[PDB]
Design goal:
binds the ligand Nc1ncnc2c1ncn2[C@@H]1O[C@@H]2COP(=O)(O)OP(=O)(O)OC[C@H]3O[C@@H](O[C@H]2[C@H]1O)[C@H](O)[C@@H]3O, Nuclear Transport Factor 2, Chain: A, homohexamer, mainly beta, two-stranded antiparallel sheet
């Protein structure tokens, strides 16, 4: 598992057998932290919709034996969108 | 692909919005959407295979008012009903 | 092993000899399900109709090669919809 | 793990070292299915609050090696309460 | 009981509502509540210890409008603000 | 092993030599945290302020005796509240 992917173009450039259906950036990356050595990645991604957005938080932790623990959570946020017009993205009023 | 697959009801009740996967790295991630009256139900799914062949799994779900997955083109999107 | 293909209580009672049910075990009614007993997974959506809307549950279970399981659950309230079980195919729609 | 507990009185009568803080029936059992042999239990519990209720779904699956997999989920339901005045409980209008 | 415990902020931001546990059977289940303006945040927690000493964990969270955990008596409850 | 006591990005960068951060890594600001590095667990609440409310995340991680981990996450929207970080103790309150 590559712990530092930030967009679908960087994913296709680093995973040789990646298969993507639909718009791979439907959930745009808001922020992410990872340590390849400590084996973890945490990210927030946002899908803009009519009148609000869908916010996803993701955690993945690699174990010493090579296995993984995973968690995901999701919520709807009214009248906000992720702004992707800057280098540092944020959620704000539509 | 699955010889003994059994489906109850509409197996596409949650229609696929997007998906990424890698068979070698052993993970898949998808978003699926069920259109209902006045809004839609959005499901996110992650599955990761481990080196010993076992799996880690996660799921999350939310309601989105006044949106439907629009399947009228090749690229689906969630938008105003 | 876990039966991954149950669709209602009557079927569970007929296939699980020691099943114990408290209350109405069809409170969360099956909307859709897919499963493979040999590949070892099931995914289902269930709906509990309530006053003014319904509660929707999505459920995933995956069997591992060593016979253990991975599991996930998620839940949301849906206003002004109910599962309709009056026809061959069930659906969520306006109350 | 006892897979068939239905109320806090039955839990105290079967678990010798059980410790309960607060009202142990804050989340009242709505429905439950379990198989001791297949090793699983699934339950819905409901906490009545002002103007609505909190609904919890719980799944626990025992593995061949004696370990467990667990999952939980929670949502708020407006203008409904669990009715406990009958033997078979239901969620309905407050 | 925990010698190296480190707490940041108010360690009781989520106040305990109820809890059940068994040290021998190896599980604990709790509900905790954070009072906010106009409502409260309700967290449910489960932890199960395995025979090999490892753990399974689960968490869930929801917002409840116009309720607070009432801590004015020995038995706490969620009720109208 | 996982550092279970991080409270902000500056502390993570100073204690995790290969940390990589995309975007503003304090987007979810720490509200409260408890951890024991020796017992192997951490529990935290983080808040992302947005227009008209905030997003609240609760996070749990537990280390197992074999060095592996169990994890859980949950998330909800809270209307008309923000985390206030202007004082010694942070709190969620009216915007
Ligand atoms: N809820 C999802 N539903 C469907 N598909 C998803 C979801 N979530 C992730 N994906 C796909 O996996 C790829 C890499 O994911 P990843 O390497 O495992 O880490 P990440 O933090 O989740 O994604 C960070 C960025 O990557 C880009 O492509 C992603 C997505 O195409 C995206 O623009 C992300 O914003
Ligand atoms: N949130 C729940 N709360 C309480 N109890 C639950 C829940 N969810 C499931 N149960 C009980 O387990 C039995 C078998 O479940 P299962 O075999 O593991 O598969 P499934 O997809 O979850 O349920 C498919 C159908 O089975 C029937 O009986 C179920 C339920 O009585 C039902 O009519 C289901 O609609
Ligand atoms: N909440 C559910 N409730 C009931 N059943 C479900 C759910 N979720 C998935 N299923 C069933 O599993 C099949 C394959 O699942 P899969 O191979 O494991 O990956 P996926 O990302 O979840 O689904 C990608 C697409 O597959 C199609 O059939 C699905 C569904 O019939 C669907 O149209 C999906 O849109
Ligand atoms: N979100 C919770 N928060 C705090 N505490 C909880 C929660 N959930 C469960 N508990 C406690 O465990 C005991 C047994 O739990 P159990 O044996 O593991 O199975 P169950 O289906 O979850 O609970 C079925 C019934 O048991 C009674 O006592 C429960 C509770 O005091 C209750 O009235 C339940 O309605
Ligand atoms: N939902 C998230 N989405 C994206 N990224 C996240 C999330 N959640 C955490 N991160 C990143 O991991 C780093 C270390 O996290 P961690 O060490 O594993 O502990 P923690 O309790 O989750 O975060 C405590 C503080 O750490 C700082 O940096 C964090 C974050 O940049 C932050 O200011 C936290 O407020
Ligand atoms: N979402 C959280 N965010 C930050 N920190 C958290 C959260 N949740 C828990 N904590 C911290 O762990 C300590 C012990 O946790 P614990 O021993 O593992 O069990 P518990 O049921 O979760 O908490 C029972 C009571 O303990 C007190 O201190 C807690 C908290 O400081 C609290 O007042 C609890 O009300």
């Amino acid at each position: 598992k590559d712990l530092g992917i930030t967009e679908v173009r960087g994913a296709k450039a680093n995973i040789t057998d990646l298969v993507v259906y639909g718009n791979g950036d439907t959930f745009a990356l808001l922020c992410k932290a990872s340590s390849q050595e400590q084996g973890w990645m945490k990210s927030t991604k946002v899908c803009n919709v009519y009148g609000g957005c869908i916010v996803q938080v993701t955690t993945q932790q690699r174990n010493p034996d090579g296995s993984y623990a995973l968690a995901e959570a999701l919520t709807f946020v009214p009248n906000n969108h992720i702004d992707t017009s800057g280098n540092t993205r944020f959620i704000g009023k539509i």
